[PDB]
Amino acid sequence: QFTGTGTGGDVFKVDLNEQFDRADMVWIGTASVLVWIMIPGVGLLYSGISRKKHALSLMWAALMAACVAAFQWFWWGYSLVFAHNGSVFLGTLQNFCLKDVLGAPSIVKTVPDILFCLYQGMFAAVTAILMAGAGCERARLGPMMVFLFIWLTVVYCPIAYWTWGGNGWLVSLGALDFAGGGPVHENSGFAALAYSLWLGKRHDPVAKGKVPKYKPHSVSSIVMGTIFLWFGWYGFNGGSTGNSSMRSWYACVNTNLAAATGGLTWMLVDWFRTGGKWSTVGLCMGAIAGLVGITPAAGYVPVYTSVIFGIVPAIICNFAVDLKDLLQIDDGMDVWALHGVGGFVGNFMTGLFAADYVAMIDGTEIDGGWMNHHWKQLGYQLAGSCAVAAWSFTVTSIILLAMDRIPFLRIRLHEDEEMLGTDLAQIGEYAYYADDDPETNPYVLEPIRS
Amino acid sequence: QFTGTGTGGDVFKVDLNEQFDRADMVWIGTASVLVWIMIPGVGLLYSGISRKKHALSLMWAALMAACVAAFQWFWWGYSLVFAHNGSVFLGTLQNFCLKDVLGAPSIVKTVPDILFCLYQGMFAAVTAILMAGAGCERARLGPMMVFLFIWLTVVYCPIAYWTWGGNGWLVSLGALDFAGGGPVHENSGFAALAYSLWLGKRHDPVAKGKVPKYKPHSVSSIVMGTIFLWFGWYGFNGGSTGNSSMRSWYACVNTNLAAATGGLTWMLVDWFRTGGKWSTVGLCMGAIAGLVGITPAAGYVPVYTSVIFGIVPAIICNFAVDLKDLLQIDDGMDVWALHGVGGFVGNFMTGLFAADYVAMIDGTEIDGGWMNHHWKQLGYQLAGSCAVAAWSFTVTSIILLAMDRIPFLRIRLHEDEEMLGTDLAQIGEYAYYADDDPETNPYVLEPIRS
Amino acid sequence: QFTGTGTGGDVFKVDLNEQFDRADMVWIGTASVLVWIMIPGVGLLYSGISRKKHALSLMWAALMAACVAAFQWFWWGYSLVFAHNGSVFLGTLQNFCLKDVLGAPSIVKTVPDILFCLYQGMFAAVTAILMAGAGCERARLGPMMVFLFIWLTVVYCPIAYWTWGGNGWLVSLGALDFAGGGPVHENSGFAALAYSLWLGKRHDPVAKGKVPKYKPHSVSSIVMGTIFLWFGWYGFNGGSTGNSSMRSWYACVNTNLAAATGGLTWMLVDWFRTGGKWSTVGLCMGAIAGLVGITPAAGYVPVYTSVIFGIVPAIICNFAVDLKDLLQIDDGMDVWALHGVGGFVGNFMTGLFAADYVAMIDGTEIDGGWMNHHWKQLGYQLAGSCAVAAWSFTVTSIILLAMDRIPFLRIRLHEDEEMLGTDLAQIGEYAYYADDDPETNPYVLEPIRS
């Protein structure tokens, strides 16, 4: 018999696959593979956009993040989000090292635990490289890897549990978050802001007003990142139905249209604000703003409203990027502006435009948003957004400051203890610091103490 | 009940998904995602092959084209091709802003309208970047975006309707075009030729005989473009069955073999013509020539004949590229040679090698080509090819010349009104023109009037 | 009726697709497309890692290999592995030019011949670029293409037959090889070693001890290669079930975890051995070592053991790379170390950790390994590994030395007959040798005789 718990049954006695539609499984398997390539997509995007020379290559750091996140997820991340037996705030260690993760129907009943594990693990990894990218400036790699492991454990996993978990309190409340805009984008964005405000370079010369808003390290990297992100986002959003229904393809149409209108909107805004220039970076940032914006909404809103999920996040995020000038901080702030602000805005607008008849395309039951005169929905969205932002900002701050107090865990060295790469390159043991060309340097040019 | 029209039925009363095989839908969903990455594939290919420094980066322009095409398709492109109620030449605005596009079976009855919309929208976008690439030299971006919107509307959509539309006159005639070689490749190719002959630089120093046939801007971009194109072409051709049958995988085998033999053929032709050199660009152009060649044929011809769809387009396109020397025009001509000539040749040969027993692999009924002694088939193919070439060349010419007469819509400035980037870089307001390195320049170095 | 042989039946009388689960077919179709992009993944990886300037760009050579392998596979490669009527060592020419390859159930009964042909053809192509990459230094292209065709025919196809063929003697013996670690990785690795020992540069200045272990040509190429390889490996391993069951997704979870732990392990080993440096190349090589390691095991071992398939191959391969210093040979040795040694180690450990209850997830019956007290399994694995290594090393040696004796087939010129690119660039007919920048050079800078 099928037990519905643990491994789901004895494989020598039952065929666990009989519980699931095979095409549902194939689409979520494919969607998993698509989300995986978003991981280097993030790295390429933020490597390319940077107005500063990062010692750590974020294209490469994306592979590091893929490794650390996969291990964390296996170790206990999956279990802390999707153990079928948690509180309303967190799971348990019931599935430590993926013990008994096999063929029981997952919280998404149309796929087995092992496949939901594969799929959702990719979301954790995308969030990991968002966070690594946000905090990469003058990062020490050892501490960064420890930080990512800890951060996934006590920031990502709780927020993911609230959003996706069987007893997650946001689920119970009635908040909507179609493809995990909260755990991935809003979360990483406000964690990025914690990094900016505590560890980021202040009075940063690249952020002092009379300097260009856009000054990319590599436009080709921006474009390649945006390509991988848009391509992969079809799995990110399209797979968030958990099935092969046409709500999946509907979500993909919304995804494409939000990206498209976001890109054009941001570029048009830049055109107006610059007095007629065509912004290469702006088009890409706008596509990302729309992809982020539509993430909580893609399987819930009517197709024609998806254009609003491009336009409004593009406009608001474009102006949010200007805050870097007020603060005179660059580090971490792009991730905050696109993912934190974009995620907040998209989540809010999901309360306005969610429609029960869109969810019903595959039989999913929701009360809907303002499209259905369900006025309360907007309050549920705000509650989710504020909770995510509060937890992510506060707990990320605590982790960063706690690690800072520990010499061998300090992620970013204090400027009074930091050795100059110019001077390191003169010391014999550190002569390899003379090659700050990450295209040929075999070693990360890690900050060194005195 | 299932209505077969409009949304296809009331989602609160019926499950629209019951009409479709879930695995059919998953493959066409996946194929959609694969065709999307062909869009930057085109941009990379034509950016890399260029013998001239384009101010507009085509890798980046591919994302711009993805945005413009997605919006056009949503706005009315989809409706003009696939409204279930058009003439024999064009659709209607019944599905303006994708109104009522949901779960009715599409013209391809094995998938719902919303999924066919997703899939076919990708073909429009691939064609958009082919056209943007063809017309990119000294292009002004604002006018280019307007041009693409207009061109998709009155050149792409009619030709697509004739080919795929429920009452399309090419369909009724009996012409074969498996994966839309007409609307995508032959169309963009002869539109490219219109660009070359009216707007392209004449007496072009890079096309004056004593200069190299191959002189690529970036071989790595050529190769990356070819990679994305070949990878994505499995969705382009493999999804054109509309189903999960083994005719889909048969089409993929044909696709791979045509690419392979095209690449080797073009490189061998170059080897003979150069007296023993191995042409890096030639291998890539040959793979594209074979992919284009097999596009109208992939689900119709026996596997062993797919090698002819590599060899013959490779040879003919290789010599077509030489016409650039006779004309002394470079701009737009590569797109014409590969897609216009390749598409024409492939469409012609489909009349020779189409077999009813190949179509019958998934129950598709055709009379076949010369393989079945259906001699008339070749005439149907020629009719389609000539109609596509005539409409695309003529109407593209009219659009380009009409926009040229309008100062704020002129796509390419006349040489007497065009400001020198060298001189712009001296004027204070235009000092950013001094950085013509598109890897770090945040702005398109758009042509400026006097 | 369904015949089970030849084309599988008359398409005008029966629907051949009725024999197969459509979702099984869609996943293997998708997996085919994913394995295809591993081909340029290999090229990028070995182009980037190189401590030497290769005249042949391996990114480009990957497309050449895709062409040659697809043609060989069509011509007779498929038939020599999967003709339903061979010996215990090789197939026949029954499916020459894919004659009668259509809808009969393949050796993997859940998919038709034409789809298994598509899928398995990709494995041949991945192996082809591994071999081209291994033997690329100072290679002449014409001879290289002939070599690849011959090598696929008499080295790859026999080993593939033993592993996958209906009567393959390794299958009969009881050896386990889930995703073809033998035919692809161990095979190419020991073929690479044959290249190193017979044709590779000896007393190579880059391999003389006092020089860096890691000195990459292009870290961005390494990372992009690793991205394409890890992404594609989900199809490589995940599709090796032949079905849409959750054993496919289980294999993907193992694949991701082995890559992740391999990357971290190799980087940590480098950290210890260098006294605290963070190795950019090492992380990537470790992910590949884990992907190779888990390949024979992914659908057979419990998830928690997949971490061992990252850790142990990473450690052993890391030290295997040191052999380059002892031998003072660089050419071919990276492919041997990762794929030859990694493949050998993974195959061995599959005998330890294979579990009948993992195979049983989709009803697959195996005796298992030491996890099931099936002690004999380790001996079966060793037999397979030694047979593959012996055949590949010996026959590759014979091919290389035989071609060397034939002036127009010699793959690498002898140093006494080899012309200097510096001196070629002075001879008028060879002036194009002055541009050794493969990013703009339209021609392969092939070695020229005196």
Author numbering:
A (entry chain A), B (entry chain A), C (entry chain A): 4 to 453
Quoted from the paper:
structures of the Mep2 transceptors from S. cerevisiae and C. albicans. function as ammonium receptors/sensors in fungal development. a central channel for the transport of ammonium. non-phosphorylated, with channels that are closed on the cytoplasmic side.
different crystal forms to high resolution (up to 1.5 Å). sequence extends for two residues beyond Ser453. differences in the rest of the CTR.
